[PDB]
């Protein structure tokens, strides 16, 4: 929904993520807890967590991290022709973990927010805005599924 080039600038910045999946989905797991706390009550395995240092010696923060970052870049690599990725991940999140869409738009910034912390010097205006516009198109087809599943929100 970018131009090519668009996605060239985002599959080079994912570049810097996939040299370490995991340390990139940590922090931004943790930008998203510190940034939108209720986010966190969806959480059943986390709630516990009090503080960034508990946040940050969880080991399955650090798992689930990965695994999101993960299902992200698959769905990012498919450049726009994602829908065989996306639905599973709106059902389970739709009808399973109840996650409204605003929530997406709370780990869209946290994702941004990593990647400009981490890597500045690589994360220039362009960069920016092709990530910001792919992660619009993931949160805008993942709102769609929501629609026809019959949930919104
Ligand atoms: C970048 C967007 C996201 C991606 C790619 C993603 C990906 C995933 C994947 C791959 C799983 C495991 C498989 C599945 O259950 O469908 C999962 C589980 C889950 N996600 Fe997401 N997710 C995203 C954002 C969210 C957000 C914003 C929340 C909550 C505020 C969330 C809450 C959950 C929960 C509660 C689970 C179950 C955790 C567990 O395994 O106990 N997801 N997610």
């Given at each position: 929904?970018?131009?090519?080039?668009?996605?060239?600038?985002?599959?080079?910045?994912?570049?810097?993520?996939?040299?370490?999946?995991?340390?990139?989905?940590?922090?931004?797991?943790?930008?998203?807890?510190?940034?939108?706390?209720?986010?966190?009550?969806?959480?059943?395995?986390?709630?516990?967590?009090?503080?960034?240092?508990?946040?940050?010696?969880?080991?399955?923060?650090?798992?689930?991290?990965?695994?999101?970052?993960?299902?992200?870049?698959?769905?990012?690599?498919?450049?726009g022709h994602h829908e065989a990725e996306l639905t599973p991940l709106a059902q389970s999140h739709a009808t399973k973990h109840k996650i409204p869409v605003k929530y997406?738009?709370?780990?869209?910034?946290?994702?941004?927010?990593?990647?400009?912390?981490?890597?500045?010097?690589?994360?220039?205006?362009?960069?920016?805005?092709?990530?910001?516009?792919?992660?619009?198109?993931?949160?805008?087809?993942?709102?769609?599924?929501?629609?026809?599943?019959?949930?919104?929100?």
């Amino acid at each position: 929904g970018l131009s090519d080039g668009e996605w060239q600038l985002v599959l080079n910045v994912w570049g810097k993520v996939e040299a370490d999946v995991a340390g990139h989905g940590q922090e931004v797991l943790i930008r998203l807890f510190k940034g939108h706390p209720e986010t966190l009550e969806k959480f059943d395995k986390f709630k516990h967590l009090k503080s960034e240092d508990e946040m940050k010696a969880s080991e399955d923060l650090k798992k689930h991290g990965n695994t999101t970052l993960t299902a992200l870049g698959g769905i990012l690599k498919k450049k726009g022709h994602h829908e065989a990725e996306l639905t599973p991940l709106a059902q389970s999140h739709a009808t399973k973990h109840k996650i409204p869409v605003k929530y997406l738009e709370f780990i869209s910034e946290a994702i941004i927010q990593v990647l400009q912390s981490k890597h500045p010097g690589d994360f220039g205006a362009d960069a920016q805005g092709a990530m910001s516009k792919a992660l619009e198109l993931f949160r805008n087809d993942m709102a769609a599924k929501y629609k026809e599943l019959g949930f919104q929100g």
